[PDB]
């Protein structure tokens, strides 16, 4: 019926990129750069947050089936955003994406687009569509962060602080392979779990079950704390390695 789009962390050491001699750090760097490229390109074009994420998800999924040494990343990113626009009904002309990508990429980077940037991008759509197996619909942590937050009641300002802090964590998790490891519902919970720990907020009290310490279980059944902690660790590593710190 539908394909499975989630792999285990251990499986990531066997991406085509890894097996063509790319080391883990490099693939991770390439992944963040391609994601931030999609993120930055679409933002300049005024795109809805879902459209950016959808493009990023396609991109992350693509390089589970292909190698970064044979398919340039910024070309791939541009194609992902192009299809994402048509999928999520925020369409853009390919020429406009190229225009923006040229504004943001230096001369070396834009070299990936070759002599005819538009053609190189439009040509990949066939491959992208086959690679994503034509499973165009994608759900993102955003909608669940809001669906779950709407059922939290208490101090308006404390809950809003959690949501924005968590929303920031979602945007940051798009730079990681978490999109490939855990369903979006878990991500939304994981980001709530983290924001709560950082703000010293005890989310349980705002639930309809205020003595249910495991508040997530009323939102997402069968999620061990282990998974939420693993996700938290992965989100925090990006903040520790970069000069950027936790939003708070």
């Amino acid at each position: 019926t539908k394909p499975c789009w989630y792999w285990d962390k251990k499986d990531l050491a066997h991406t085509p990129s890894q097996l063509e001699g790319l080391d883990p750090a490099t693939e991770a760097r390439y992944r963040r750069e391609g994601a931030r490229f999609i993120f930055d390109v679409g933002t300049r074009l005024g795109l809805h947050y879902d459209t950016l994420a959808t493009g990023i998800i396609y991109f992350h999924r693509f390089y589970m089936f292909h190698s970064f040494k044979q398919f340039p990343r910024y070309v791939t990113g541009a194609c992902c955003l192009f299809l994402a626009g048509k999928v999520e009904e925020t369409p853009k002309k390919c020429k406009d994406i190229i225009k923006t990508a040229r504004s943001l990429l230096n001369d070396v980077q834009f070299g990936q687009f070759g002599d005819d940037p538009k053609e190189e991008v439009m040509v990949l759509e066939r491959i992208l569509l086959q690679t994503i197996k034509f499973d165009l619909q994608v759900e993102h942590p955003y909608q669940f962060l809001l669906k779950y937050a709407k059922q939290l009641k208490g101090d308006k300002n404390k809950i809003q602080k959690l949501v924005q802090m968590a929303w920031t964590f979602v945007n940051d998790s798009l730079c990681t392979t978490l999109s490939l490891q855990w369903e979006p519902e878990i991500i939304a919970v994981a980001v709530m779990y983290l924001a709560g720990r950082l703000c010293k907020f005890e989310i349980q009290e705002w639930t309809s079950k205020p003595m249910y310490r495991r508040w997530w279980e009323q939102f997402v059944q069968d999620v061990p704390v282990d998974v939420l902690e693993d996700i938290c660790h992965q989100i925090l590593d990006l903040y520790s390695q970069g000069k950027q710190q936790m939003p708070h």
């Binding site: 439009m122 040509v123 066939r126 569509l129 086959q130 034509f134 165009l136």
Partner: protein, 313 residues
């Protein structure tokens, strides 16, 4: 596995003929070589590549893979023309969207004059269609183009809705820019005629109502060539748009621009006095001018006319 779409070759189907001329390509009838199952292949031509893979097709692939209901046409897989190896750029071959084959289309059954619908047949028809619309509308997908051409019917009596291209999601709480000119003139709601770009899911109910009246006369109800002439025919029957029945008609762009000849009074019940009352109540509610007062799909299923129909029979 069954989910790895886009890789299987169209070699696996014996093409039987061309069933129709489509939007994004031509539609062909075909027999599966392995199972002997009759299918219908919708050709997606990206050889034009003006904007690549057509969006109309992208809507039908995104939505019909999510929607599984008896009365919604099933997309079975996507297959490709022979793909040359080692030149991923050079391939311009087309993809084909595999659907189940439905024997006839309602418009063809009606245009050829070959069918007769008793009251019970119209019940079985509408119950299936509207139950399917409920499934799609409950999933917040709007099938903006609903015509006779798009309602397919098997000899079994099963009705399935098709051509879900030109279909988009609707946020229940808010509204975004919408296309407005989104249904065929004969089956277009009045709101869209007056230029509403925030269309309700009720746009589809109006079309299915137009069909409900069509099934009792064998003729479409509102036949016009121009948007104004259409509003006039709707007004001769349903009454002229005016705040008395449609308060927000004045917020719509072309309300002052597009007046009918008169401020007609509603005659729907009189001109349709031959219809059974259970049905006439359904028609009258479905063809209500105000999008907010027009019945929903669920309400049509909880009508004296469609509620007690057994689809087993």
């Amino acid at each position: 596995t069954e989910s790895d779409w886009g890789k299987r070759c169209v070699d696996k189907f014996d093409i039987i003929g061309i069933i129709g001329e489509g939007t994004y390509g031509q539609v062909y009838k075909a027999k599966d070589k392995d199972t002997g199952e009759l299918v219908a292949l919708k050709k997606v031509r990206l050889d034009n590549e003006k904007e690549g893979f057509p969006i109309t097709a992208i809507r039908e692939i995104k939505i019909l893979r999510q929607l599984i209901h008896r009365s919604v046409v099933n997309m079975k897989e996507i297959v490709t023309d022979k793909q040359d190896a080692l030149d991923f750029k050079k391939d311009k071959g087309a993809f084909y969207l595999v659907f189940e084959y439905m024997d006839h289309d309602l418009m063809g059954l009606l245009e050829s004059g070959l069918v007769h619908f008793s009251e019970d047949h119209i019940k079985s028809f509408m119950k299936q269609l509207m139950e399917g619309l409920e499934y799609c509308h409950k999933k917040n997908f709007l099938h903006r183009d609903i015509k006779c051409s798009n309602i397919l019917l098997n000899n079994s009596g099963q009705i399935k809705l098709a051509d879900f291209g030109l279909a988009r999601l609707y946020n229940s709480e808010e509204s975004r820019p919408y296309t407005n000119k989104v249904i065929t003139l004969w089956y277009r709601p009045p709101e869209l005629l007056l230029g509403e770009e925030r269309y309700t899911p009720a746009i589809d109910v109006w079309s299915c109502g137009c069909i409900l009246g069509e099934l009792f006369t064998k003729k479409p109800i509102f036949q016009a060539n121009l948007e104004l002439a259409q509003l006039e025919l709707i007004s001769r029957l349903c009454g002229s748009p005016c705040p008395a029945v449609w308060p927000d008609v004045i917020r719509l762009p072309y309300f002052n621009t597009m007046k009918p000849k008169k401020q007609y009074r509603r005659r729907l019940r009189e001109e349709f006095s031959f219809i059974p009352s259970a049905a006439l109540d359904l028609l009258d509610h479905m063809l209500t001018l105000d999008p907010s007062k027009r019945c929903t799909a669920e309400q049509t299923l909880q009508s004296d006319f469609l509620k007690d129909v057994e689809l087993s029979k």
